[PDB]
Design a protein around this ligand. Structure first.
Ligand code: PRO
Ligand code: PRO
Lengths: 331, 331
């Protein structure tokens, strides 16, 4: 009686990073996922802030919209508090858990598998299921590659050595101590502004280019590395983008990009596995299960593994006279 | 199949400030609300972090647990990301909306009224209902009073003039420019640390005392005032407590406390109304509908008015093997 709109949203976290997964209330027209995403940006961007800004989300929230697909089981429009990324690791893990545990897809075998049409390419998600429960998901991310290292001018700091790779989005990778901080919990209200400028600066000097239609040709996310805290861990990192959003997970698509750097640098060979640590201490693992050619960059095929957990099953309500229905932030 | 625990949580916002209101899964034993609250702190504090920390909440979230009452319609255990306040304005407005719009209480008249047993006293909530919709709620908050002004030592700043009042919790009120900031959106990552120390410092020098059993005798929240941005507004403020939680509303119980200061300072008379502005620009209105005696302080009876809106209706899920079921934060 009190609702103007109602959305079926199921939440997950993936090593701490939330995905608000929406399963009703969004009809979207389009030939493929890139078209459907543009049709979403035009008519439906208000849903994105109503669901990930406050009060229904928060400064760091994340969303994925299930849509149909002719070329896959479903398509996925990834969205965050600022915009729409071409791919995302943790949200795919979360979509695969919901898709299974809620019985939308046939549970099967030890692994039940989902093909997903994503902006940056078709993405296979392999979920290990015990009983009804998905215990972990392995994402066969899209081909990732190294673009180059660069000496960029960072004001107040001089010249910084910086890597730039693509793991479904383009990333600026840079060691934190090179810019005067350590990625630990305490440096966060300093890590956000630094990493944010690192994206502005990097996109002025460096240019990137992905051959695929719809993949945006700018560095959209910043990744700052440091020594991990745990013994299992090969590397720590925090990924920061948009207006200050901070990945609570080791970030699948960025981790993919890092590994593709270490592959070109020879540090990692095909078949080797890497373990990444978030600023939270949670971890992913990436195997280099293959190689292929993207445009004419040499690309790894990375396989991110982790686990996601349903945390909420919601009917998100837009109440009649809610002056703040659209969502707000203060960061 | 995938759930160890399940909670029926209904969200509201009140001028932007969320209340996660829980309606199932909590049996609590106790003679009154103070006993039931202690029984909650002992066995059930894990629910509080699982519901307001991440990933089910966030840095700024708020909760209220409905429990039975012999002396009222219900009792309410208020909780936040740090602890449990004795009273809270916006959560009561939110509980009254849910209690009506969901048909838990008989909708009636122009106003349908609810009596609530809260830690700091019995609290009447009057909801204006159009059709099914609650358009606003008026909270007859508990008797509020002025305790004194004080010259406290704030390191790095010298001596600050500071007021201390009780509006259901004790507050440190202090002008922001007196401590070198302006309460606007941009000063928030500086307003949190300042206001936080202002609570540590204030509680070392100043002592407070409320005669009622269960009302904690410490200043629990800090309120920093400045010139408002809007013309309707009599005063702007931001309320900050716990480990950095920031009120997105003008804060009912603190606004009550401010008014009780302005009443003793004579600036406001009985019957006058005040309009408060949050750091978000949202507003409450308080009338001084009466006076009474608390212990032997002279106390106003403040009536906070605003509106709250259901934003989510959730089944909060604790999944089987979720290492992070209990909740985490990074601020
Ligand atoms: O896990 C990931 O890859 C996502 C991408 C954006 C934020 N973190
Ligand atoms: O509106 C209020 O009064 C609540 C009290 C704690 C935070 N804000």
């Amino acid at each position: 009686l009190f609702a103007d709109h109602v959305f079926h949203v199921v939440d997950t976290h993936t090593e701490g990073e939330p995905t608000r997964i929406v399963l009703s209330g969004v009809n979207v027209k389009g030939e493929d996922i890139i078209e459907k995403r543009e049709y979403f940006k035009e008519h439906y961007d208000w849903i994105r802030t109503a669901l990930l800004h406050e009060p229904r989300g928060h400064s760091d929230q994340f969303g994925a919209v299930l849509v149909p697909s002719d070329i896959a089981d479903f398509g996925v429009i990834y969205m965050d508090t600022s915009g729409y990324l071409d791919m995302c690791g943790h949200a795919t893990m979360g979509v695969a858990t919901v898709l299974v545990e809620l019985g939308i897809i046939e549970k099967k075998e030890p692994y039940t598998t989902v093909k997903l049409e994503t902006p940056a390419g078709l993405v296979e998600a392999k979920a290990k299921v015990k009983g009804g429960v998905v215990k972990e998901v392995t994402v066969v991310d899209v081909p990732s590659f190294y673009v180059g290292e660069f000496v960029i001018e960072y004001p107040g700091r001089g010249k910084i050595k910086v890597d730039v790779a693509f793991g479904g989005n383009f990333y600026v990778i840079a060691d934190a101590r090179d810019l005067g901080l350590r990625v630990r919990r305490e440096y966060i209200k300093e890590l956000i502004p630094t990493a944010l400028k690192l994206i502005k600066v990097a996109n002025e000097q460096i240019k990137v280019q992905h051959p695929r239609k719809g993949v945006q040709n700018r560095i959209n996310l910043a990744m700052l590395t440091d020594e991990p805290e745990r013994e299992d861990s090969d590397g720590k990192n925090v990924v920061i983008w948009g207006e200050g959003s901070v990945d609570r997970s080791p970030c699948g698509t960025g981790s993919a990009s890092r590994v593709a750097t270490l592959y070109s640098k020879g540090i990692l060979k095909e078949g080797d596995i890497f373990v990444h640590e978030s600023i939270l201490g949670t971890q992913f693992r990436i195997k280099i299960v293959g190689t292929t050619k993207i445009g004419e960059y040499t690309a790894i095929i990375p396989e991110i593994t982790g686990s996601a957990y349903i945390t909420k099953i919601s009917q998100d309500i837009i109440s009649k006279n809610d002056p703040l229905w659209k969502g707000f932030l203060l960061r």
